Design a protein around this nucleic acid. Structure first.
Lengths: 97, 94, 79, 106, 99, 81, 106, 92
DNA sequence: ATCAATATCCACCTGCAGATTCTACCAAAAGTGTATTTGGAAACTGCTCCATCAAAAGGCATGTTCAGCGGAATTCCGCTGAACATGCCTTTTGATGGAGCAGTTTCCAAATACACTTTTGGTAGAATCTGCAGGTGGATATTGAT
DNA sequence: ATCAATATCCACCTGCAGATTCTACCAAAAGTGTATTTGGAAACTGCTCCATCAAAAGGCATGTTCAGCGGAATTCCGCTGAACATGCCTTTTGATGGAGCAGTTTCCAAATACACTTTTGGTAGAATCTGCAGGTGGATATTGAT
């Protein structure tokens, strides 16, 4: 047995749009947060709720950028999002202007 | 210590609407964030209106235009109604 | 690496929530770079608020206030 | 002239809204009706979302409202969605939605 | 034998020309009536300071010219050179104007 | 007043696409553009005129327009702000 | 002595300090505040005028006009960001044609 | 109606001694100053409240400048600001 | 169309993390009553500038023709992501000192508030000043046909 | 490449509108100088809750296989850009009359300012309770294969 490409994907789509749990693992994330901040001010401590807010925000940000990106890929009559699709989206959003 | 929040008045309202429905903490937190947000946006615009017009006072008049300027069509319709009503009832009462 | 700690499976899990069916191969590296700029923008601001308050601990409000001026208002963690 | 919220016939703290309007530095002076009007506007908007979120929860065989239910009530409402157009509701997820062209050809 | 520029040549001349100047590109009077029409049919008996009509035209043109750049990008993305309604639409959708 | 949107002629809409760097233009663009300009103006003028009324004035001033624009995140320098 | 001289500045310190009060930003304003804010305002107008000035020169002009201001702002990474959502009336756009639109090859 | 025009002009003359400015440009410069003025004071204002401080001091002003301006501009703005405050502090 | 493999749906179960309930302390609220202060509406009205009518003219919009080239449809096919089973390394979870985040108290530099005095930047307005837009022509590219 | 039709470049020239140059006035504004008030820094400190860690736990990194995606090459149709003739209506220059913006003064309903008085929402510590999330099971819809 074997599922055709895309089949498990739509399954994955249906599933994840139903849930609200975060999709990035907390530990790797927290590490990335502290790392980035260490360049702004040494020796900093983070409230667990602060990292949580940053993550909740970050994911909500990416999940949406992926929507607009999907829209740019589809615009170009494709079904697979590409780097250019992210590029075009951020550019129209002013994140590049 | 001491931390105010709209959490109880939210709960009171939740009961005139869904007497048998309850709310989770994380949810109440969102409703609290929701009230403070609207509060600020409405206040701020009221503030600006007064300043544009060289006025030292924010009245319900300012609060009204602010709602007009801030809320979407139908939502703003009701918002004005509710608001005019609360001020009327209030004034007409010792 | 840290930014590499944000993995393909997770980045793919996100794309999924966003309605993405097929994902090119160079996305994951692009995605991270974007996530990086996002956090550098928000944290920088949040950390400026931490210092103004003369604290050594970034607080959830410190983040909420940064997100708001970034135009990314977030409900649920204060204010 | 009484407990102000009761006079205006409101559940929201007409006295607290007034206090916050001042402590907020929005104007030198604050009329008497402004806090009533404003508290009335907040309460109404509060009922609106809770009203829709309740439906959202019932429609899921659930009696207690969680974030997801607030998000569903919001983004499924044209006007609220607009008002909270630049707002993120933690733990709200997104609305189910798959671009047609991505569905298997029937 | 008549001389004739190929399609796109004049177009590029125009881009170079207009991108070089700064005068408003929509007829003064026609734009004013459109303003009064819209304003009036949303509240009557209104008057307009000439400068209020000019700020709306300054804001409107600057809005549309920027919109056309985004549109032009969306067309190019789709490997085309002529912009379409669908491009203007993708742009406003992402800009969060219609979404 | 009627059909004034048609005063935004094809030649003018074309001049704008040019400054925007647009080389070729499909045929349905002109009406698509009119519809978009229309919404833009309705949004700025409504707010503008809400400011006028609040000031109990009958004349829409440049500041009314400048404040409406600032509200909509489209800040304009040059007319009192 | 004007507080501007005491502070070593061209921009009007008093006027600022005053505008801070009427603007209602806080119950009080330190004297150091308007000094700093006038310095920052003055530094900023100097930077944009330095760049507008050059733009005029580059166009063989002596009197700065809006377009020059626009060129200076759009060509400067930071001024451009600071003014990312500002429209300078009568400034045009920077000249710029996408590559794929230019003719020929190579 | 107050402006910022004579000051913009003074500064103009410092950087470009032989250059002028059309009134339409002076006008845009005026909107510019008033704009940044509001932005900074607003940032200043909220910073104060988030911190339950009733006073806006040069310290809030400086954080607001850091919060609002892009990297290099901020560094230089912060420098000119401190420099002025220090000097004003040592003078009457 | 016919299995075979799976994934999905749903009705029932229940243990517990989180929601609810009860009870008492209390400072920060919020309401009450008094005395004083004042913002800004009202009424008279100067004077700015908006709507508007007239009139002449050329710069632009309109509408046509026509052909080139852009874009949609279609066939190809090289290769790249998606699915999947294989195997362990990193995230998660509950647990323990100690660092700061807050709560509390002090007292001092600095911020109102108030009374004068002096410096200044708007401005109403006649008057001369000057960068340059718009017209000109003619030497320098840029196109496109052959 | 060579030629020819055309648009571009640009330094010179000059009209005129917009910018610069004061004379005289001034109110409000910025500054000077006590007197009084107080915001919040500075220092001591309890006690949350954050960083660290070990161990129960549960993804994710990895290589194979091939389905199908996307870009290339090709083709034909019809739509859009250039060019052109024509004549409309925008633009421009002016002046008129009056609505309405905006200044000045008068003055009370409402707002600030205490200060005594009563009430309440938030917090802490304890016990009790309940919506529902994972878990089970067996029916069944879906998908892919032949």
């Amino acid at each position: 047995h074997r599922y055709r490409p895309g089949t498990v994907a739509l399954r994955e789509i249906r599933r994840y749009q139903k849930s609200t749990e975060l999709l990035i693992r907390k530990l790797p994330f927290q590490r990335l947060v502290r790392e980035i901040a260490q360049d702004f001010k040494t020796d900093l401590r983070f409230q667990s709720s602060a990292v949580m807010a940053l993550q909740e925000a970050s994911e909500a940000y990416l999940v949406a950028l992926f929507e607009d990106t999907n829209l740019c890929a589809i615009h170009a009559k494709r079904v697979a999002i590409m780097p250019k699709d992210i590029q075009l989206a951020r550019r129209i959003r002013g994140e590049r202007a | 210590s001491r931390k105010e929040s709209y959490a109880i008045y939210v709960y009171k309202v939740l009961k005139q609407v869904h007497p048998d429905t309850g709310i989770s903490s994380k949810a109440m937190s969102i409703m609290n964030s929701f009230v403070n947000d609207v509060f600020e946006r409405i206040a701020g615009e009221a503030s600006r209106l007064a300043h544009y017009n060289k006025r030292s006072t924010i009245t319900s008049r300012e609060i009204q235009t602010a709602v007009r300027l801030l809320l979407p069509g139908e939502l703003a319709k009701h918002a004005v109604s509710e608001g005019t009503k609360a001020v009327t009832k209030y004034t007409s009462a010792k | 690496d840290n930014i590499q700690g944000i993995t393909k499976p997770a980045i793919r899990r996100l794309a999924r929530r966003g309605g993405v069916k097929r994902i090119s191969g160079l996305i994951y590296e692009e995605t991270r770079g974007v996530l990086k700029v996002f956090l550098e923008n928000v944290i920088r601001d949040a950390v400026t608020y931490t210092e103004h308050a003369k604290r050594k601990t970034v607080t959830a409000m410190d983040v909420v206030y940064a997100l708001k001026r970034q135009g990314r208002t977030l409900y649920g963690f204060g204010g | 002239a009484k407990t102000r919220s009761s006079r205006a016939g409101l559940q929201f703290p007409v006295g607290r809204v007034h206090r916050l309007l001042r402590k907020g530095n929005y104007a030198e002076r604050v009329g008497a009706g402004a806090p009533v009007y404003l508290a009335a506007v907040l309460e109404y908007l509060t009922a609106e979302i809770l009203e829709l979120a309740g439906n959202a929860a019932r429609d899921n065989k659930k009696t207690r409202i969680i974030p997801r239910h607030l998000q569903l009530a919001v983004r499924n409402d044209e006007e609220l969605n607009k008002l909270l157009g630049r707002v993120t509701i933690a733990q709200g997820g997104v609305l189910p939605n798959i671009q047609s062209v991505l569905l298997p050809k029937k």
